[PDB]
Amino acid sequence: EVTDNNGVKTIANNLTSTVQVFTDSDYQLPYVLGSAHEGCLPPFPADVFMIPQYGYLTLNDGSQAVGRSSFYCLEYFPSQMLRTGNNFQFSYEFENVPFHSSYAH
Amino acid sequence: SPLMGGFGMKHPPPQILIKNTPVPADPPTAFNKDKLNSFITQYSTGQVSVEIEWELQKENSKRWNPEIQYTSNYYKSNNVEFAVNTEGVYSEPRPIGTRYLTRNL
């Protein structure tokens, strides 16, 4: 928790506040991984990184939406609440993707 | 995929060719080797029934903006859409597509 009194930054932790985590495990959200968006994990392990913000795009006739323009509300998904003593874990099985070509002809 | 739309099948449902057999009218008393071109005019009638079970793929999108659907306009008009005219002729006013729901790429 960050407190700002007279421009003095005092940072004391909340042993009660919760942080939500959930995985879009049915791809029913607009997939935004896959354009090399600069928010990915730090090349050097020690490097502490800031988690990038999630914001999608939909249809747009100019800058105005259309009827098909979808609005996915993230909280409408079953989250999981971690509150400083819990951990999250999902195991994912990669589908049969062909071997990449690591060789020059 | 046939460019007019539909399904491309290597073995589509077969043709059902129907012919009502010739019945020669009255061949001569004396023999004659020709093809006996004098048949009695006739036709047929019946019913034909085609039961063709489809398989669906139900939709489970987590979209929050209401989907776009196909409806028949509520407004007074001389004839109901897709309903017979005063003379009995069945009139279809507009072609109906099959792409109304929305699924993200």
Contact between A70 and B102 using a beta-carbon 8 Å cutoff: yes
Name every chain A residue with its beta carbon within 8 A of the beta carbon of B60: 26, 28
Nearest to B63 among A31, A72, A77 (CB): A72
Q: Is B61 exposed, middle or buried (0-12, 13-18, 19+ CB in 10 A)?
A: middle
In whole angstroms, give the CA distance from residue A12 to residue A2. Answer: 7
**Owner of token pair 């009827």:** A67
Q: Is A28 exposed, middle or buried (0-12, 13-18, 19+ CB in 10 A)?
A: middle
Name every chain B residue with its beta carbon within 8 A of the beta carbon of A73: 64
Q: Measuring CA to CA, which residue among B50, B22, B54 is closest to residue B36?
A: B22
For residue A73, give every residue at least 6 positions away whose Cβ sits within 8 Å of its Cβ, in sequence order, or none.
B64
Instruction: Supply B17's token pair.
Output: 């060719």
User: Touching check for A102 and chain B: CB below 8 Å?
Assistant: no
Contact between A72 and B60 using a beta-carbon 8 Å cutoff: no
Interface of B with A (CB under 8 A): 60-65, 68, 102, 104
Q: Is the dihedral of CA A2, A5, A9, A15 positive or negative?
A: negative
CA A90 from centre of chain: 15
Three-class DSSP category at A59: coil
Give the distance from residue B64's alpha carbon to the nearest chain A alpha carbon, in angstroms: 5
Amino acid identity for residue B27 in this structure:
P
Name every chain B residue with its beta carbon within 8 A of the beta carbon of A29: 62, 104
Instruction: Supply B34's token pair.
Output: 């020709």
Instruction: Supply A30's token pair.
Output: 């607009």
Instruction: Supply A27's token pair.
Output: 């791809």
In whole angstroms, give the CA distance from residue A26 to residue A57. Answer: 19
In whole angstroms, give the CA distance from residue A8 to residue A59. Answer: 45
Contact between A67 and B68 using a beta-carbon 8 Å cutoff: yes
Instruction: Supply B85's token pair.
Output: 């005219």
CA A34 from centre of chain: 13
Task: Count the residues in chain B.
Answer: 105
CA A60 from centre of chain: 24
Contact between A67 and B62 using a beta-carbon 8 Å cutoff: no
